[PDB]
Design brief:
PDB class: transcription
Radius of gyration of chain E: 20 Å
Chains A, B: DNA-directed RNA polymerase I subunit RPA135
Number of domains of chain H: 1
Largest sheet of chain E: none
Distance between the termini of chain H: 23 Å
Order of helices and strands of chain E: HH
Largest sheet of chain H: none
Organism of A, B: Saccharomyces cerevisiae
Entry title: Yeast RNA polymerase I elongation complex stalled by an apurinic site
Bound molecules: zinc ion
CATH superfamily of chain H: Homeodomain-like
Chains: A alpha+beta (about 120), C alpha+beta (about 300), D little secondary structure (about 20), E little secondary structure (about 60), F alpha+beta (about 100), H mainly alpha (about 70), I mainly beta (about 130)
Oligomer: part of a larger assembly
Helix content of chain E: 10-25%
Largest interface: A-B, 48 and 34 residues
Shape of chain E: elongated
Strand content of chain H: under 5%
Radius of gyration of chain H: 14 Å
Keywords: DNA lesion, transcription
CATH architecture of chain H: Orthogonal Bundle
Shape of chain H: flat
Number of helices of chain H: 4
Number of strands of chain H: 0
Structural class of chain H: mainly alpha
Amino acid sequence: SSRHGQKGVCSRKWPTIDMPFSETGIQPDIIINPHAFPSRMTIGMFVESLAGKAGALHGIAQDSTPWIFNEDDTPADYFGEQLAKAGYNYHGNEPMYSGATGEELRADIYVGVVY
Amino acid sequence: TGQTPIVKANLYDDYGMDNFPNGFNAVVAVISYTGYDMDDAMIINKSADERGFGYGT
Amino acid sequence: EWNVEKFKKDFEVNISSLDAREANFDLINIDTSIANAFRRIMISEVPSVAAEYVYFFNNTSVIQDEVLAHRIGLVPLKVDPDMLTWVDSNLPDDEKFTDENTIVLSLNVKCTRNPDAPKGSTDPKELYNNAHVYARDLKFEPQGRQSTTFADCPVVPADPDILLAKLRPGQEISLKAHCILGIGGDHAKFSPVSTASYRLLPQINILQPIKGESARRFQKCFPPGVIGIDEGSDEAYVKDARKDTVSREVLRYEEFADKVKLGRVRNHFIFNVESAGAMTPEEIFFKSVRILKNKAEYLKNCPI
Amino acid sequence: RKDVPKVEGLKLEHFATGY
Amino acid sequence: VPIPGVKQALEKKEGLFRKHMMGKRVNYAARSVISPDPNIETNEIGVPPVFAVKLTYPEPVT
Amino acid sequence: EKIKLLTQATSEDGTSASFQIVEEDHTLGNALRYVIMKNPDVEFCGYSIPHPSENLLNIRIQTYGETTAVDALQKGLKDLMDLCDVVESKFTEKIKSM
Amino acid sequence: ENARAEALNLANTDSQYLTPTSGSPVRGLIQDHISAGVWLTSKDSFFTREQYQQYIYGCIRPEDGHTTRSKIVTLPPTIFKPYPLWTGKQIITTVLLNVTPPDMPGINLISKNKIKNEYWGKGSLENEVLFKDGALLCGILDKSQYGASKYGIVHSLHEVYGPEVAAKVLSVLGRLFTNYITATAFTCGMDD
Amino acid sequence: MIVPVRCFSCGKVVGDKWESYLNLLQEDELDEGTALSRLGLKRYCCRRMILTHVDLIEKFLRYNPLEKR
Amino acid sequence: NTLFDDIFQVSEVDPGRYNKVCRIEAASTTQDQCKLTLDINVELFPVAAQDSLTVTIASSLNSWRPPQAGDRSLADDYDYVMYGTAYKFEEVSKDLIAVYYSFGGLLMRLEGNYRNLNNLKQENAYLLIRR
RNA sequence: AAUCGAGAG
Ligand SMILES: [Zn+2]
């Protein structure tokens, strides 16, 4: 589980060659379906992936204590600026390639680091 | 082998939770790719598993 | 029509760099079906040597035996994989290991307190003797013909500074580890690459001229050596695509929303290979090519 | 309210493989 | 505290009818967590090898 | 034992067969399928893995005629071998050049 | 053997396609397969000969009894020039053609789906699913078609071909949209 | 507890860099990003392995059943 | 053999949330009442507004197999040939008719006088376009 | 065997 109540059982140990890989070369160690979010509405997990990627890139730790951001200073903007100033994109997407066919996937893939 | 969170509250240090690690920072792809994680399942990399990811006794 | 000759006319390789650990190169006019085959073979099928069977004789340390054996299995070994054969699993445990397929490593280390340590010393290396166990402490114990065949090149870890364990006085570790040939599709410890992958060569199609100050900001939306301002006319042009990390920061401005299209060259793969330490990256790639060819030949010669 | 403190000294960390 | 009588032995849900006639513990059954599998037929079940060696079927030899 | 012809799917004239290969995955399957789809005589070609947890690969080859699925498979395998040979030779040439 | 025959014929899962509560279907693909079908059956989906044949074989695999012809039958491409390009709706059509028994016509279903025409732009008619002789000619397959929905394609196949063929169609569609989802992944993020 | 031998994601050997990371943090007045870069950790998957290690082995080692306290 | 032929002046092209296909509103230059709507992938046959296209519907080109050396067909005289089937007819009014074609999901609606559209029947037909 | 407490769906 994440720290946002996204519990789930491990369904398969996916071999690393069959895992999708990014333009950076890294292959995620956890895959979570995008359909876990629309009904659960855990946007904290999205912003935590964003902030974790930015922190692991800049070698910093970001605080996540509630009510430090607001609707004029959005964490999306904050961590996106931090990601853009490091060579990755604003929205945390990464160009990934299918590990079974080797083709680039249809769209950029949302990746990051979460606890 | 636990790790400290990259994203943590300011009170994580105030209660000294680093003395008691609870998890690990993981590279998580929000992707519908495998077919083996739809309802609530999740997929763990086999190689990461063999490198001691999430091991315990 | 497609033919091997028509592929041989157009395929080409551009080695961008090559070290003893990392090799960066290009494969042009090839299909993802073959580039991905090479990448998958590099990660999973190319053999290497790692610790498999650990025979503990004493472990009074804080790290438990299974964890210590796992760590000893993870440390990469500078062994040429051709120098040893493959273990026949069906054979009994007595005759399974021999001098031509098994490499014996030992680790005997006792911690005793240092009686000369200064008062107020907080450094474990000054307070205790052998308070740290490193991969370099894994001695190599040759047996049989390998006492002569390995005399040219003794077996040492590729990273002798790997901190295997820590000790305190009275505590000790005494173990033997058997190292054999294995492939990374079985266990990730046998994988001979830190990471081998590729990426398509990015394309930056400029559609309309970006003359003026817009060139300064358009060039500002890419890695530093990707867009340049032409000396003659104040125009932006693509200098180097390989320098671009595809981040689509240009798309985030509606100024350039209809001035540039970002795509890829679907046949121009930039292979980046890093070696764990046992083999050079160029030899890793060569072995993967040979593995694909040999497996195809085995299928060809197999009766149906 | 003071906005969240913008971290300073932010440089490029991501470069294309081989460079 | 009081020692149950015969009527108390059958009266309720925890009695004898509802716990040993209407429902029963059974042989040749198994229980485990479920995980998804899209490569299994929609009319099938994915049986672990640990169950497949403990569950048997009487087969008259012909 | 390595390569097996699935008789329940083969054609009587041999122009449409189906092959089961053990200990193989996308790595060989995709390469072989791409190379076989270069034969101008093959009508249908694809690969499928019945179950990911099993190391079994299935290859289907249907030809227009004048050959067989076995012959198309042999041609694709040989073409794959030659493709690997040319890649190896060109890589070595560029290594020596440097 | 009596309990075997009861479980195979009376309590088997392919007999429970419709629940008796209201006669509505209770089986069908759920989330990733639905979101994959929306992508695969839009007009913007074109597939070369290699991609088309790979998808069809991957979802069919005739050696496991999935075909009714012992040899995969394909369709001519939608676009002949400049180069041969098929469509995802053609993928659906040939999937049906290979699972649906021969010497029997194809389904003629007129229905809808959940996505209004206004979401695809002016003049679109993709809200109106249409089958004719078993060829998907308009609209996108959705949750309304395969899923717990009445009068969709899987329900109509159930009605016209028995429950076994609808079970085969569910399995084949699940395999199709799974192999498609690894080739062209699906994701969500902050940009959405 | 003790530093992992390899990075979980890619597999790069990062077990020989924890002591160097501490040295570069203490002796040199380097920030964490600079120290990680100067160790050769470019991918954030490798950076996190050292940036977030806790090193509980030191606290475990103070409870020694084999030496008088 | 051919069943229809005309020259159409493309009026509007709208992508509509598609990155590959576009909807074309093309009105004929000869017949004042014959108009056309068609979906084609404009990454293979790009079309702009105010363009002239020679649209031909043919019953054949004189099963399928990728082209080989020495093969001739009606497609060689056109730039963009689609295959499909007719599914719907409609009496728009007196002296008017519309035929609905589906090319694997790409929709064409050809409305014209039934005198010149009488050759079109509910069968598989090839659409051929030229600039 | 009960009773109490902790859990899972
Ligand atoms: Zn890493």
